[PDB]
Amino acid sequence: TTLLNPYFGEFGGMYVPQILMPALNQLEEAFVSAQKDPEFQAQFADLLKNYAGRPTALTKCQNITAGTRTTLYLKREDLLHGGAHKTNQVLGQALLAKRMGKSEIIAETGAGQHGVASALASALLGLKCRIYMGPNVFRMRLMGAEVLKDACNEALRDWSGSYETAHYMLGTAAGPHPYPTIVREFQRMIGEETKAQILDKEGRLPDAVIACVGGGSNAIGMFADFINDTSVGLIGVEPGGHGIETGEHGAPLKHGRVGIYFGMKAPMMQTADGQIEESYSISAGLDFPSVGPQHAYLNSIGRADYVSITDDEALEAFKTLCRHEGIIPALESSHALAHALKMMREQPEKEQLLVVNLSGRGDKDIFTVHDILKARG
Amino acid sequence: MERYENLFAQLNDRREGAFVPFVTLGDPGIEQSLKIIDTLIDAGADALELGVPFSDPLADGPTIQNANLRAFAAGVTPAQCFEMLALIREKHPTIPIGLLMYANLVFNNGIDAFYARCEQVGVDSVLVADVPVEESAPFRQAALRHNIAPIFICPPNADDDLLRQVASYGRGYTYLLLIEKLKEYHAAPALQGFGISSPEQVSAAVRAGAAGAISGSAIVKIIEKNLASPKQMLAELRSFVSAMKAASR
Numbered sequence A: 001t002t003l004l005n006p007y008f009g010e011f012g013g014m015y016v017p018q019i020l021m022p023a024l025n026q027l028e029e030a031f032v033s034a035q036k037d038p039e040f041q042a043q044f045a046d047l048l049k050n051y052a053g054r055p056t057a058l059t060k061c062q063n064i065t066a067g068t069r070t071t072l073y074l075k076r077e078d079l080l081h082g083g084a085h086k087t088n089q090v091l092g093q094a095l096l097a098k099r100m101g102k103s104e105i106i107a108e109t110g111a112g113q114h115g116v117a118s119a120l121a122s123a124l125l126g127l128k129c130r131i132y133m134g135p136n137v138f139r140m141r142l143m144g145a146e147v148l149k150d151a152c153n154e155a156l157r158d159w160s161g162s163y164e165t166a167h168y169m170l171g172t173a174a175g176p177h178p179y180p181t182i183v184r185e186f187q188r189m190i191g192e193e194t195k196a197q198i199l200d201k202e203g204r205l206p207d208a209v210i211a212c213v214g215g216g217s218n219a220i221g222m223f224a225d226f227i228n229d230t231s232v233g234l235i236g237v238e239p240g241g242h243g244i245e246t247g248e249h250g251a252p253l254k255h256g257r258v259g260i261y262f263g264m265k266a267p268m269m270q271t272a273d274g275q276i277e278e279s280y281s282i283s284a285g286l287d288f289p290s291v292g293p294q295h296a297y298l299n300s301i302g303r304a305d306y307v308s309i310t311d312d313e314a315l316e317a318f319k320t321l322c323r324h325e326g327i328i329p330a331l332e333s334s335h336a337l338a339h340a341l342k343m344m345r346e347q348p349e350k351e352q353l354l355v356v357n358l359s360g361r362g363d364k365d366i367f368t369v370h371d372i373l374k375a376r377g
Numbered sequence B: 001m002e003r004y005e006n007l008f009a010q011l012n013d014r015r016e017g018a019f020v021p022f023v024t025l026g027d028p029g030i031e032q033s034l035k036i037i038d039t040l041i042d043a044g045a046d047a048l049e050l051g052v053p054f055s056d057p058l059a060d061g062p063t064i065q066n067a068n069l070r071a072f073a074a075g076v077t078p079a080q081c082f083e084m085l086a087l088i089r090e091k092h093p094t095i096p097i098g099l100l101m102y103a104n105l106v107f108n109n110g111i112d113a114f115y116a117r118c119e120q121v122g123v124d125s126v127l128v129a130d131v132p133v134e135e136s137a138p139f140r141q142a143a144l145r146h147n148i149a150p151i152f153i154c155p156p157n158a159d160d161d162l163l164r165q166v167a168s169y170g171r172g173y174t175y176l177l178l179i180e181k182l183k184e185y186h187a188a189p190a191l192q193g194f195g196i197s198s199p200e201q202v203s204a205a206v207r208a209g210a211a212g213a214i215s216g217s218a219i220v221k222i223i224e225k226n227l228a229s230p231k232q233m234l235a236e237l238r239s240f241v242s243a244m245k246a247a248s249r
C-alpha cells in the first residue's frame, strides 16, 4: 500500500528487501504531508532563496548563435551555491529528514557534487552526515561530514536498521519509490523559473529544453513544468562515451534493456545474462548504468526524446562556452550544450528557441580537461 | 514435487526441527562448491539455500558479499549454477533446495522461463531478496505455475497486514527474522534465519515454536577461514553442521 503511484507506466516500483519497505513508506508519507504544509514550503523556499541563491539566471548566448536562426539560453544552475543543481533537492530532503524527527544523513556520490551537496546541507541544518564512496573529499570533511555503482549499495546497507534515526539522501531521480517523485518535485523549480524567464524575455515558450541525463534529476527538474506544454520539446542527453558502438558509454535508455536493480525497474546496461554492466563517460556525473523511471516512461510514450553525445563532442562544447561566453561548464552539462550546438549547426536557418540546462560549473573538471588537451597536444 | 511438506511431516514425526545452511554456488569454485554442498548434506542439513552470484548483491552482509566475489573470481555464471543444481539434485533426490536470487537474474530473460528452468533442475523454492511482498505478484504466480515455492521474509517489525500477506503468499517455509500469528494465519512453517550461529540458537528457535533455523552466514564464515586448506574446510563444515542438526533433535 502506498499513497502515490510507485510506477511510471511499467517503470519504477519499490524493488528493495522487505526490511526497507517501512523506511520507504515513512518517507512517502512525510513527503505527502510536507507538500501540503505551507510552513514546510516556506522554509524550503527560504533556504533556496537566501542560502542557495535562487532564482538562478537565464543567460542568452548571442556570441554562440551569431549567423544562425537559433536563439540559445542557458539556465544557470552553475550559479547555485555549491556549483550544481544538486543543491536544490538535498535542501528539501534535509528538511524532510528533520520533519521525520531524524538527525543523521547517509549519501554517496560520483562527481562529488552530490556528496558535497549532502555535506553542506547537513552542516547548515545540524544533521550528522556520513558519505560513502566519493578535492571533493576534503570539502566534505571541512563541512564536518564523516566519509561507484556499489556506492549506491553502500548506504542502503546502513539505512537498513538505521532509518529510525537516519535518512538516505539519494542523489538523483532514480531508485525505489518515492525517490524519483521526491527528487523531481524538489528540482522542478528549475523548469518553473525557466518558463517564467523565457516568457518574460521572449513572450513565448521554448521550442525545446535540453538537459544531460545521468540518473535524471536535473533533466526531470527542467522538464517537469513543461510536460503538459505539448509544443515544447524535451531532449535528454546521455553520455556516448567513446561511442555507442564501442560499448563504453552511459546511455542505457537508448542502448540497454529493462532490468531490476537499485530498487527500480528501468533500462539498464547489462550483460546477456543479466549482470549489471559498468558504464563509461568522460564525466563522472553521467557514469551511471541506468536512468530514472520517469525518463524511461517519457521516452516510451514519445513525450521526450533521448540522444547521446560523445566525450569529444562534450569537450568541444566545453571549450566553445569557455571561449565565447566566458562560462566554464561542467563536463556533464557540456553534453547538453553539445547537442544544442549540433541542432543549431546542422540546420542553421531553422528558427528555434532553445534552453540548455547548465546543470553545473566546471571548475571541478579543469584538471581532467587540461590532461586531455595536453595529451592531444 | 512436495519436498518441503514431506520434510516437515517427517521432522514432526521425529519431533525435531530443520537446520538449513546457506552457501553461495561456485564459492570458491565449481568443483569445491559441489564438494562443500555434499559435505553439508552428508553432515545432516535438512534443506539447502543456495545463492547465484550477482554483480550487485544489495541485500548481502560483508561475509556474503565476499562469497560472491570469490565465485566471480572463478568465472561462475548463472548457467553454470543451473548445471550445478541439476547435478546436486541428481545425487540427492529428496533434500529441499531453495535458491536465494536477486530480481534481475530472475527477470532478465523472462520470469516464467526462470521458474521453468528451476523446475527442470529440481529446485524447490526461490526467495527473491529485493522483491517485497507488495511487488511479488508476477514472481509468486510464475513460481506456483512451475511447482516452485515462493519464499517471503517476515521481518521483525512486521505488522498484522504484512503477517497475513506473508502467510497467504508464501509456500514451503516462512523466512523469519510472530510465530503464533503465522500459525494462526496458517503460514508456511517458519524457519528462523536471524543470527543462527550456535547450536543453542537452533534449540531456542524450535522451542519458540519455529519449525527450524536457517544459518545464513555461519557456513560462509567457515569457508572463508580455510581457503588454503580445502580438506580442513570440509571437516570444519562437517563438525559444525552436525552440531547444529543435533541441536534440532
Ligand SMILES: C=C(/N=C/c1c(COP(=O)(O)O)cnc(C)c1O)C(=O)O
Binding pocket: A084, A085, A086, A108, A109, A110, A111, A112, A113, A114, A115, A171, A172, A173, A212, A213, A214, A215, A216, A217, A218, A219, A284, A285, A286, A330, A332, A333, A359, A360, A361
Ligand atoms: C552524480 C553526481 N552528479 C551528477 C551531475 C549530473 C547528472 O546527474 P542527474 O542526471 O541526476 O542530473 C548533471 N550535472 C551535474 C553538474 C552533475 O554533477 C554526483 O555529484 O554525485
Ligand SMILES: [Cl-]
Binding pocket: A002, A003, A004, A005, A006
Ligand atoms: Cl496510488
Ligand SMILES: [Cl-]
Binding pocket: A035, A036, A037, A038, A041
Ligand atoms: Cl500547500
Ligand SMILES: [Cl-]
Binding pocket: none
Ligand atoms: Cl505561474
Ligand SMILES: [Cl-]
Binding pocket: B091, B092, B093, B094, B095
Ligand atoms: Cl537427498
Ligand SMILES: [Cl-]
Binding pocket: B147, B148, B149, B171, B172
Ligand atoms: Cl508449492
Ligand SMILES: [N+]
Binding pocket: A213, A214, A215, A238, A239, A250, A251, A252, A279, A286, A287, A288, A289, A290, A291
Ligand atoms: N547514465
